[PDB]
């Protein structure tokens, strides 16, 4: 009877840090998948199953819209088979991903004079994430042999670090809102 509400996740006022990424489910609607592809307001619009056109020529069991902010330079890691700090410890697409990644520069909203420190990424983790895993732990990370006994200090690091989004940042270091669409019948073209 009505549109899938992509205005809820795309034009949302606040976005989530990558370590604690948000995920919306999308059911029982129809989604015009070419008012996103023909927008032109998106720096990035890659898909990994089949085409943004034949996608709205199909129905699916359910659709996922994951959202988060990262550095523009890290968007190359939101893709199957990548590595790096974001794909390993924060948000991991599976090797067989069928969906679309969308990204736009957000330097007007998410950057601040003096640095915007509310966006965080996970810097320290002993081992890689599984695909579509969310880790929101803040347990002190033990980098040496001695246990930390719950005290931040040497070899005893808080695992989350801040992107200090300042406006004067070079564009590869500016904030990028990202949305990932997953496809696995409730919504169609």
């Amino acid at each position, epitope marked *: 009877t009505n549109l899938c509400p992509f205005g809820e996740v795309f034009n949302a006022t*606040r976005f989530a840090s990558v370590y604690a990424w948000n995920r919306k489910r999308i059911s029982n609607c129809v989604a015009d998948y070419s008012v996103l592809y023909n927008s032109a307001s998106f720096s990035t619009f890659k898909c990994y199953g089949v085409s943004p056109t034949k996608l709205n020529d199909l129905c699916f069991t359910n659709v996922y819209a994951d959202s988060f902010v990262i550095r523009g330079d890290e968007v190359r890691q939101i893709a199957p088979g990548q590595t790096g700090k974001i794909a390993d410890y924060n948000y991991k697409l599976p090797d067989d991903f069928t969906g679309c990644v969308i990204a736009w520069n957000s330097n007007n909203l998410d950057s601040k004079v*003096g*640095g915007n*420190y*509310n966006y*965080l990424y996970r810097l320290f983790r002993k081992s890689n994430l599984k695909p579509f895993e969310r880790d929101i732990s*803040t347990e*002190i990370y033990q980098a040496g042999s001695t246990p*930390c*006994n*719950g*005290v*931040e*200090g040497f070899n*005893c690091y*808080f695992p*989350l670090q*801040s992107y200090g989004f300042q406006p004067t940042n070079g564009v590869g270091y500016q904030p990028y809102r990202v949305v990932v669409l997953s496809f696995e019948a409730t919504v169609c073209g």
Partner: antibody
Amino acid sequence: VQLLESGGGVVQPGGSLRLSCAASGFAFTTYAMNWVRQAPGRGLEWVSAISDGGGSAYYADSVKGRFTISRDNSKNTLYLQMNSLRAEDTAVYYCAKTRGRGLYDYVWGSKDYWGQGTLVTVSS
Amino acid sequence: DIVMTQSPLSLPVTPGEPASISCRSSQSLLHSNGYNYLDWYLQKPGQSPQLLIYLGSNRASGVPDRFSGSGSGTDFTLKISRVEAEDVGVYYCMQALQTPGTFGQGTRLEIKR
């Protein structure tokens, strides 16, 4: 790292004010914050602490009830609401961030950077 | 409430000489995991307190190496290996263990010239 404090002045006895602390240059959402106060020429006395995302708050027994500390992580601001103010609550009021974020780095503990200070006087 | 008593309350010192300030607590401050929950703050004239020493003997970020803390359990010492004119101020110890944070009376460090 900055902790710039607002509010403060006079309030008639028995009345109410709210101090504000606007933080910049650090994570803030990850740190605990405190309020400490100094009476003119008297030494420091701790007042209250609040954890990372509200949730846990502590108070000295001399102020439990009238003083409530809160923060808004979106606006990067810490707050202290005061009530039933006396002449014994006239003091300089310091926000301070606690040093570590480990469990056992207690939210009321070591205070890493302190704000400029805002004076709150209380008299007819 | 834990009681903190420093000694002495007035420390006159000549530049280039050492200074040392003793704190004592009524309850033991050893271990909430193996550390001493003792802090040393300094308050220069007209300024806010700054952290010098935390967890007993750890130098805070940017504090000069001439500052040092020592001791365990109940008797603690802050030592200034060489006093400089810019060190004038009041030095407070503080416990960081139990819920009412409590400070010492303060040590007024006066500079002899």
